[PDB]
């Protein structure tokens, strides 16, 4: 691949070959718009398509601050 494609893909983890469960491939210049935690196919090199996700990961797979969303006034 090119220097640009290599540099861009450093911020991403290549999960595998093209998976059309995630739709038509993004271009390299569109790839930065991919939401954190999501997966997308991307066009690279000479027509190759791979599935990727950002290495920058959001706090999704973590614990909760569920206590407390609601508080009742007693006493």
């Amino acid at each position: 691949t090119s220097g640009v494609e290599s540099a861009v893909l450093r911020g991403f983890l290549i999960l595998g070959k093209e998976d059309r469960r995630y739709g038509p491939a993004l271009s390299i210049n569109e790839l930065s718009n991919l939401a954190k935690g999501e997966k997308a196919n991307v066009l690279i090199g000479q027509g190759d398509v791979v599935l990727v996700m950002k290495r920058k990961r959001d706090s999704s797979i973590l614990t909760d601050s569920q206590t407390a969303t609601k508080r009742i006034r007693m006493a």
């Binding site: 911020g11 920058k56 990961r57 973590l62």
Partner: peptide, 15 residues
């Protein structure tokens, strides 16, 4: 939970 999220934070920096 602190170690885990400390690790998580550092993982996003090493990215």
């Amino acid at each position: 939970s602190i170690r885990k999220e400390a690790c998580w934070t550092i993982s996003n920096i090493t990215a």
